[PDB]
């Protein structure tokens, strides 16, 4: 029941899922060996020995990260199978991860996914984790999403994608990979969630107050947000919202499924007991552009739909008061044809803190998943980078000699242009 | 009801030896021979495979045969080798040389008189004999020729008795003899015309399991013999132990083949698992059933997808509920109607035994005859005919007493068997 | 290698575990045994 199969694709998804499963085990009381000294059913399967194993598939084209997992303290938790590692990576090449290396591993990945799905009688959703900046998570991610949507059908899909930021980017061909994979995400992704790195970095610098934050902290924040999102189906609450429950509210149109994510209170132990932890204050911090996990200013845009999911000792009252204050204040403006425009999902299980982490124990938390017309900004940035790099034809022979035609890039550029035009059209007033 | 074992050739001797340690330890017998089991169920049918001594020692109901004394040396040096009775040890001085002619006509016949004397005394000691079983390899003339010679006159004077036989048909991938197709062709026709059943072991698929399903570092012939021994124990588990729905060798034979010609089977055991899955994957009937019908668990390397399951039977072991054991084999009925033959309704026989194999809480042995059991006979016939185009390696046989046309008769029997298999493969209602 | 290790999920707990009683004894008179 409430089943969510986790898929991590490549290095980025693998580390993110490692943090996510860390959080899941800590908040479900599962020891690293895999036993507790039925809320776990949606993420852990219980075998005859009394041990629980995660319902996740790590899928990488390079073995370093999966070998780190297989040598880590969580050897006895993760299944030796459903841990697929290729032998040569995509090396920041969507074509190489989608056409040659990905083709010889997608069949085995599909077999593993089918094995996972056969074990669950209440399959509700797939939680994909990837970064389209790289090659593996872009190409193999596109192939996996295509095959999963072809086979399973209308099963809910939530792709948490780490898009390349406007300025802080670790590779040059990331615009190509992102533009090429945007078409695949658009066609076979029910809900896509931004996970840009600059926003998380700035959030940790200013709010977590970490001088030198890292990928571990970023993945900890992502695990926190996924736990807040899935807690509604995991535990009891006043407003239990399932995957489809909040999916039917972020997608006015099939082409409109890219959303921004935000979490609060993202604070350390020191400030946890200096600030006032009221639901209204946390919601205000959430709606504040600074308190958001996507480097995308919402003021330049205008919201289409919102989902606030509250975790902990929250009550519907001050949730209502926060909603009323949000309506009253004109700093953040909403679309005219959504009077309601709010999902409210309340859950009674307060967040847990990973020992040795940076987030503090807090009685209440808010996670906002918002579909907004401001999302066009990051697409404009990425396709402007794509156009600049495409003007005089760089990093193109790598894709051409790998099995991709030169016209695929142009088709992807037209798809991005159409998506931007559709965003502008739906954001236009009457 | 009891079974008299026979071990022909080096391969048969080692496989049967492993079978004997597994049976003895399952029944609670130490290699010294005394009983130390803590359950009455081990004792209550220890008489199926073990004879009482005056001092109370349990001696195996087995006979050993070879033309090389080295195999007897190895068997006795084995961990449980001194369990066997000494007069059962029957060995020759000169090996067959992988020559079916030497194994069957000249060298084997000189010792088969003593072999039959031992078997006849053994059966007369048996109170109400349920059958014989033989373990042998068709590749070498020592086990193929002498084993078929033993069968030929065991069935002559035990005609109404079950003749269980595990034939190890070697494969071109693990081929290590050039007279291999000769011996296989010259043994298969006795095996088919003169046995109620004759069921297959393939060294290629054993290695395939040890590589892909079971994933060991150094699985030598010992591990292969261990799997074959475990499935041998499973095929008579129901006879030796109680269960919800019991069966015996005759009881499975009478409903596993539809016609007396077609009595060749392919193997199966569940659960086969490595250290990456034994502690992780839950032991359940669903896992057992899903692992019973894939080639990667099948320990004979003829792909069942190109064939049609003419009939199959499943001997479950362990305390388990009685619906799923055949509900999940009704699922296969419904989902693989193409794999299952049409004119046999409910192609699946099921038996349940209360006692699982030692060290497991749930197990099952899969034994079935399909139409893909035709492929290895086709390929053996190809190789046999290919050398027969110019009488390759034929003088070693024809100068030992064999006539040229006996090879023609064997080839004709191969053609009849493969034609029979294909015509009931494509037979329609 | 060792058969118990090859076939048993627990290499030491499985082969030392006692054999299960027959379903007849486990069901038909277990309450009389009490």
């Amino acid at each position: 029941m409430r089943e969510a199969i986790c898929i991590h694709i490549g290095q980025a998804g693998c580390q993110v899922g490692n943090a996510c499963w860390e959080l899941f085990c800590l908040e479900h009381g599962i020891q690293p060996d895999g036993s507790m000294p039925d809320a776990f059913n949606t993420f852990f399967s219980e075998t005859g020995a009394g041990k629980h194993v995660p319902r996740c598939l790590f899928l990488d084209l390079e073995p370093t990260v999966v070998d780190e997992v297989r040598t880590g303290t969580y050897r006895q938790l993760f299944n030796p199978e459903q841990l697929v590692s290729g032998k040569e990576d995509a090396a920041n090449n969507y074509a190489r991860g989608h056409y040659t290396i990905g083709k010889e591993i997608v069949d085995l990945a599909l077999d593993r996914i089918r094995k996972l799905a056969d074990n669950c009688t209440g399959l509700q959703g797939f939680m994909v984790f990837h970064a389209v900046g790289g090659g593996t998570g872009s190409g193999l991610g596109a192939l996996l999403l295509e095959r999963l949507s072809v086979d399973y059908g209308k099963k809910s899909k939530l792709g948490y994608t780490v898009y390349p930021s406007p300025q802080v980017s670790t590779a040059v061909v990331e615009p190509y990979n992102c533009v090429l994979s945007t078409h695949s995400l658009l066609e076979h992704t029910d809900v896509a969630t931004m996970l840009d790195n600059e926003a998380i970095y700035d959030l940790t610098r200013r709010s977590l107050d970490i001088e030198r934050p890292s990928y571990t902290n970023v993945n900890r924040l992502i695990g926190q947000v996924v736990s807040s999102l899935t807690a509604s189906l995991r535990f009891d609450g006043a407003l239990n919202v399932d995957l489809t429950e909040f999916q039917t509210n972020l997608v006015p149109y099939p082409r409109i499924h890219f959303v921004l994510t935000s979490y609060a209170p993202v604070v350390s132990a020191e400030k946890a007991y200096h600030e006032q932890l009221s639901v209204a204050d946390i919601t205000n911090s959430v709606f504040e552009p600074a308190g958001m996990l996507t480097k995308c200013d919402p003021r330049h845009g205008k919201y289409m739909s919102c989902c606030l999911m509250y975790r902990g000792d929250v009550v519907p009252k001050d949730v209502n008061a926060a909603i009323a204050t949000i309506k009253t204040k004109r700093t953040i403006q909403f679309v005219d044809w959504c009077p309601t425009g709010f999902k409210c999902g309340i859950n009674y299980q307060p967040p847990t803190v990973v020992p040795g982490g940076d987030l503090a124990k807090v009685q209440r938390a808010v996670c906002m998943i918002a579909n907004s017309t401001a999302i066009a900004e990051v697409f404009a940035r990425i396709d402007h980078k794509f156009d600049l790099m495409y003007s005089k034809r760089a990093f193109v022979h790598w894709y051409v000699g790998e099995g991709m035609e030169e016209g695929e890039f142009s088709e992807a550029r037209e798809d991005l242009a159409a998506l931007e035009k559709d965003y502008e059209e739906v954001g236009a007033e009457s | 009801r009891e079974i008299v074992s026979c071990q022909a050739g080096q391969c048969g001797n080692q496989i049967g030896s492993k079978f004997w340690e597994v049976i003895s330890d399952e029944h609670g017998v130490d290699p010294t021979g005394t009983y130390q089991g803590d359950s009455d169920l081990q004792l209550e049918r220890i008489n199926v495979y073990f004879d009482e001594s005056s001092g109370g020692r349990y001696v195996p109901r087995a006979v050993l045969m070879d033309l090389e004394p080295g195999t007897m040396d190895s068997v006795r040096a084995g961990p449980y080798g001194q369990l066997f009775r000494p007069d059962n040890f029957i060995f020759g001085q000169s090996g067959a040389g992988n020559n079916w002619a030497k194994g069957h006509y000249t060298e084997g016949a000189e010792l088969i008189d003593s072999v039959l004397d031992v078997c006849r005394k053994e059966a007369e000691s048996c109170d109400c004999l349920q059958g014989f079983q033989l373990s042998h390899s068709l590749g070498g003339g020592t086990g193929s020729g002498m084993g078929t010679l033993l069968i030929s006159k065991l069935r002559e004077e035990y005609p109404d008795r079950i003749m269980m036989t595990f034939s190890v048909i070697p494969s071109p991938r693990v081929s290590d003899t050039v007279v291999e197709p000769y011996n296989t062709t010259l043994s298969v026709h006795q095996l088919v015309e003169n046995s109620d059943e004759s069921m297959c072991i393939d060294n290629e698929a054993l290695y395939d399991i040890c590589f892909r399903t079971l994933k060991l570092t150094t699985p030598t012939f010992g591990d292969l013999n261990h799997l074959v021994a475990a499935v041998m124990s499973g095929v008579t588990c129901c006879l030796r132990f109680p269960g919800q729905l019991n069966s015996d060798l005759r009881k499975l034979a009478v409903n596993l083949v539809p016609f007396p010609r077609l009595h060749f089977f392919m193997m199966g055991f569940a659960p086969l698992t490595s250290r990456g899955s034994q502690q992780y994957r839950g032991l359940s009937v669903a896992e057992l059933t899903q692992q019973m019908f894939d080639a990667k668990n099948m320990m004979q390397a003829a792909d069942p997808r190109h064939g049609r399951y003419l009939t199959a039977s499943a001997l479950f072991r362990g305390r388990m509920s009685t619906k799923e054991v055949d509900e999940q084999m009704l699922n296969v009925q419904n989902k693989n109607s193409s794999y299952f033959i049409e004119w046999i309704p409910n192609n699946i026989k099921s038996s349940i035994c209360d006692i699982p194999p030692k060290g497991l809480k749930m197990s099952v042995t899969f034994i079935g005859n399909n139409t893909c059991i035709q492929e290895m006979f086709r390929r053996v016939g190809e190789q046999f005919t290919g050398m027969f185009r110019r009488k390759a390696f034929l003088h070693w046989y024809t100068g030992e007493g064999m006539d040229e046309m006996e090879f023609t008769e064997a080839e004709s029997n191969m053609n009849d068997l493969v034609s029979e298999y294909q015509q009931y493969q494509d037979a329609t209602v | 290698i060792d058969r118990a290790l090859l076939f048993s999920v627990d290499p030491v707990a499985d082969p030392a575990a006692p054999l299960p009683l027959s379903t007849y004894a486990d069901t038909y008179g277990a309450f009389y045994y009490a």
């Binding site: 040598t71 | 994933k215 570092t217 490595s274 250290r275 | 290790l5 290499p11 030491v12």
Partner: peptide, 30 residues
């Protein structure tokens, strides 16, 4: 495919370490 000694993480290595661990368990039991 050249075989490497234990401690190198290419090929069957996880199963190899698990096999050595359960061997040690069986031996200590005896």
């Amino acid at each position: 495919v050249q075989q490497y000694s234990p401690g190198v993480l290419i090929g069957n290595w996880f199963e190899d370490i698990a096999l050595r661990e359960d061997q040690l368990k069986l031996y200590k039991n005896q």
